[PDB]
Amino acid sequence: STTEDRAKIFLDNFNHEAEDLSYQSSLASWEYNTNISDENVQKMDEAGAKWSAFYEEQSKLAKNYPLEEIQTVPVKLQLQILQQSGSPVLSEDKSKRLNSILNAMSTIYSTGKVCKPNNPQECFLLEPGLDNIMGTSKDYNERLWAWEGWRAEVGKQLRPLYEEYVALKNEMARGYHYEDYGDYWRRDYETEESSGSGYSRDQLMKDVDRIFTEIKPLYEHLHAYVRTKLMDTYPFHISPTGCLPAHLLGDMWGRFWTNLYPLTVPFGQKPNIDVTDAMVNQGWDANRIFKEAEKFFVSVGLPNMTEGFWNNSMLTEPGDGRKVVCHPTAWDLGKGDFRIKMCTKVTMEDFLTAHHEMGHIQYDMAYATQPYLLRNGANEGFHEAVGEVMSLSVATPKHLKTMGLLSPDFLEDNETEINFLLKQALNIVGTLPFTYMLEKWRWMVFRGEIPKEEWMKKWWEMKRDLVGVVEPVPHDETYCDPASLFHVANDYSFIRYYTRTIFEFQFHEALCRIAQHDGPLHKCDISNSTDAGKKLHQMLSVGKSQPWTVTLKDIVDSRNMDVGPLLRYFEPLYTWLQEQNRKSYVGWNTDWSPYSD
Amino acid sequence: STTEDRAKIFLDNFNHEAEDLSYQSSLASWEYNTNISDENVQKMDEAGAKWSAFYEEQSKLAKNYPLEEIQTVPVKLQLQILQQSGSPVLSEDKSKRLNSILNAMSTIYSTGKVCKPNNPQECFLLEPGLDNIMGTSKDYNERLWAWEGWRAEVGKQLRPLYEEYVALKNEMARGYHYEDYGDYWRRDYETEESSGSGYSRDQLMKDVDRIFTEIKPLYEHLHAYVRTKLMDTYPFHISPTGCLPAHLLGDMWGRFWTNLYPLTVPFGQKPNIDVTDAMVNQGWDANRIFKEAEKFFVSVGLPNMTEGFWNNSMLTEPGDGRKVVCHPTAWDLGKGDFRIKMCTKVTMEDFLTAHHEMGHIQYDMAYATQPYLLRNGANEGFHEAVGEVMSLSVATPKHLKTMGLLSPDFLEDNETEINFLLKQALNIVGTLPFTYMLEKWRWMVFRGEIPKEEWMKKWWEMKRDLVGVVEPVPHDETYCDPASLFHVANDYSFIRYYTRTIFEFQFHEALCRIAQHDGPLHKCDISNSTDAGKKLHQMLSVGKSQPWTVTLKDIVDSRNMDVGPLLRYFEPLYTWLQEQNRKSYVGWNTDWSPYS
Amino acid sequence: TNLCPFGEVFNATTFASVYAWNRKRISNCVADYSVLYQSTSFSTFKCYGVSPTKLNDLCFTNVYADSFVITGDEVRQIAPGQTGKIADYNYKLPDDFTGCVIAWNSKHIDAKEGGNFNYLYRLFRKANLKPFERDISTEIYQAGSKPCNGQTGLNCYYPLYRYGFYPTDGVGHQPYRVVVLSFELLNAPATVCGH
Amino acid sequence: TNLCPFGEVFNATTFASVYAWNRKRISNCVADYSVLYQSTSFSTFKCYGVSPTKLNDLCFTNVYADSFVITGDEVRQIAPGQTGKIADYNYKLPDDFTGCVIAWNSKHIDAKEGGNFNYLYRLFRKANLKPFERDISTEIYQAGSKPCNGQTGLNCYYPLYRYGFYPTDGVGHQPYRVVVLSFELLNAPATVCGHH
């Protein structure tokens, strides 16, 4: 009978036949990430190949069911994701060449190593030693050697590869009927309709651009503060009106200013809200970190981690000489199989991380009842945001006090407040212009707005202009510094890390108000709430079965991205910074550099 | 005996000779402005030159009383003001070259004429024609001709002069142990102490920077709104993500966006509040305007005007029997001689201006008894601020309703208020980054950070980065576009208009607080708040006899400048603009240009 | 008069697919149901219309043991008035069902590395099954107006699909062995009695 | 029995400069002071040690009429126990003063277009004046150890300054004509008496 009847049966069949295929692809991809070897690469390739073939044939068959005569929204959605797919887009030669370029870039990033100039026998990889230097070192020249060495030994290699990678990805994108690869990336937020008023792909650019200006004062004050304190540890290398040197920002890129906290803490006489040392002293291990995260989620009414999660996850780097991907990832393999892969060090960063990744898992579990095709966050930002929302309440000194970690007397006041909000600000505010500038530079490169001949030039202009961060050494076009960050050379979009931030605070504010939190946003800890947990789980269950705007409206009673909450969360820190910078300069002069004064 | 005892006597004598001379000069000058003749310009330049020679002499002699030895704050302050100026530093020959440059730039500006491209016979002046075109035109190419024409025929003439001017002015400034001419101009905000806690001349730069960046959300949202409305009327020439072209901004430079209101009004069906018609109906003349304004000041417990004010001021264009300067001014000649020269017309604009000007005079009166050198606003921003604040209360819809100029049947819904706030925002919020940018260019140019070969290059870069405004045609270094503005080419410091604005709202918010105003700050009216009057007279009477940080703290309970009050005044327009820009870009791309 | 053969039903080495579920008829016997109750190896043991401890006093004319394998998530459908792929199209219990349903996790036996696809189920049917009805037809399901006569293709599907059981499967997806005992109340003499 | 010559004092065409104030000694006459009290043409009329309604009942051995010109703001200094440039260095009244101070605005007579600088005052002096003392010296004031031989500068100033009286002056700066009547109430035969 009805076309939609027939489409529901079609998709029924499609779900059941797709289950084992995807499962075997996740399973083999997983074996490869826990045990990397050529053999396991072969297994990943053939498994993925059957996934692709099957998907093609199904995608074509979905076009027999025309969208016009489908009445139900989740059915029409599934048919949409099937119909607007297919794989015959790039010639086979070009596909093999793209995949080999992707592979090359990935393994260069993960194997690239820089040696010391006075011991070419002694190099470092990024993933342990160079990370350590850039995250803890307080010597200028050392940080310079590692920053430049990485961009010169590994970036310069990734340049010609990256140039080809753009052309091919853009071709594939144009084949799918997208403006460019960037547009194709931005499709993640797009929503169909209601009255003809849906989220369009250009809109994401507009909202991102609007929030960026709205964040300018808070960011710039944070920047002026960090600038004056850095003057103390690098005396003759910082201009009080200049940009900030990129190699001095606490990690290999300045993605996060967290590790600047010992160099910038407002009131260091007060204890320590970096609970790393306390964690170590108390005998914490990987299992403790994750059992504790679990307990937190349970407390708001959410389920335990599944038995299979504990059984077969990799929560630490193995000691049996297997090589692995230490990059943290949360896996929804299917068939109820949820796993986390990370190499857990006993630090507060990984503690928080463990909440973030467990938040990914908790989102997957809740939309597991949705059809196969609809098992996905409302958008990438949503999925990235959930775990972080949890880690906000966890990070609170009040919450920390209750689980060891801070001595029970402690005593909170406005100094410990400022300490905490300064730490958060390093992590959260410091990353917004960075994430923004990186993805914008990518987007414009994809749109052809930036030619090859200006790629580094333009890049550093935007670092100077938007981020207020200047390169310590001039870089010509043989460099490819965007690619020296994992996400760019491994072909992941990066705007997820910006929207997430915004969404996170909207979530926090909604949930805190459901917790009946009496007071400032930043003291809120939704532990033991349950009503909070139920409201959040009501959100998570929807998956992508429903326009991320509509489900957003069901939580924060708004349909739009809003930094209002982020701003109110930091407002105490903001007025404090305002007083502290009364005798600093605020903002920066993009013409100063450390190689030309 | 003591060096301070001798200093007091020197200042006694100085103030006494200075009073007579100043008044003589002010008197000659006033006669000229209200009676343009060659005879009267002779008298004014003679009076001014005896006064100048006296001030030079006294200033040299002041340097004989060491400041360390002085303990009293007014003596020391007077001495400081007398010591850091007036005394010569340049040679006779180079004094004369600098003066001839200053007068050559003034006259090159006052007389500039720009001719129609294909009709060389018909030409225009800035004073009427060009001002009119840039205010009223919607012709892209007409505006472009006027803008470029003015910059090419005047600017390029100023460029060599402006360069030698920067050198000589810098040479005098450094002669006074200031680091450049910009540092000199910043001494207005300098203050001595408490314990070395004095406002320093670099602190002005820091503050103006902090404010600049704290205003970025409001400005870039406003700019956003203006960009999309400009698109409706300039379809081909406005990039949704680019800077606003410089020649489409409502006047010859984009200093105010006021004249864009018909292009960007929020709600065009609501009527604008213009009581000009209503005033004509009631037979009002200029005298009635000034008596109402006086009533406003008395109503807050300030004094009425002096009898000399009414006999001596020129309130109307003088019976059309003499040639006169109609630009509104408030004159504190001296010796209790307060006057207003203004060609009052029975318009709403002139009505408001009257309050602005009587504010200036009220300030003059409050501090009339301080020493000569201290009869001034706490710093350059204070006086004009006081004027602006007065115009705020007076122009509110409630004030006009109680006065009878606006019908009580007028309805103050949320739409009317948005139209008003947006007109305010054009004028007030527009000029801030423009003013910041201009004075920053000049400070940098003075200090040597911008070399000649890049003067215009950086000017435009700064226009694009700080103002979000892009030139329509490229300009090489033969141009001197800064100098095509009155103040630049006439050696006036410009940042006052920035600080003024910041202060105005700090004032307004405080005074309305004190007047127990319940509601939105933009609908405040301090009338019959004698309490506000008292706190205002407190501030006015001190002159610049006190660190302006102290007097500012006495009024607004804050020691440092704050855009808080300005942001908060405009916050309803803000949240509105945010919903309006929901489907528009906000911010700009500095690379895009009309010609590229 | 010797004891019922429940071990061959429960402890059988192979179980049937649900679509072709296996029935054993229990007659002319005496049983101790206490072994079933005291097992402590059953994930599910739900009794309807009777109590497991009351079954030792009860006499029944006949007992039917139905056995098959399904996923853990699907066990909830083995109950009166339930709907789902299992209940609609594979094994349906009547509303007046009186008996017990026993199930246990069967992953060690019925899951293998690389997946165990021995076990099949029915995904489509023209109408829901009647209680205790079995359909083992392998007829192409006609979901469209166009007859599929011959074979597979658009809008016609082969009705039976296979479960794939892996040791890493989630619990809801792991294999479960189900035994359903129905106690019928016949008009004739009771032949199946408890201790 | 002829009347006191107060007409010459009050109605004089020009008055003296405050620094060199003019004094007329009034003796052996009879005068009606009700004319002065009921005049209504005086901005200031304040009496010390005596009542104005009642000096028509009083006889005095001597009466001194002092007349000079000062600015309006300065009239307040013509009173006992006052300080200012005028009271310190020009005209000083004793603490135990018995007499009246009368003043009126003189703008129409003593201000002229372009300024009237006929009237001088003393700006500097080494010590304050004693009551009723007059100092007309034109000596360069020496404010430094260095001797001044003359002229000006180097901390030496000419003691006398000129008022500039304009019609456009503010009221505080306009010229005022002051008559100070002193009654020398001590002793001897009283010959200066008031009729009714």
Ligand SMILES: *[C@@H]1O[C@H](CO)[C@@H](O)[C@H](O)[C@H]1NC(C)=O
């Ligand atoms: C099945 O075998 C186990 C072990 O031999 C035994 O414990 C259990 O009772 C048996 N079940 C039946 C029904 O015989």
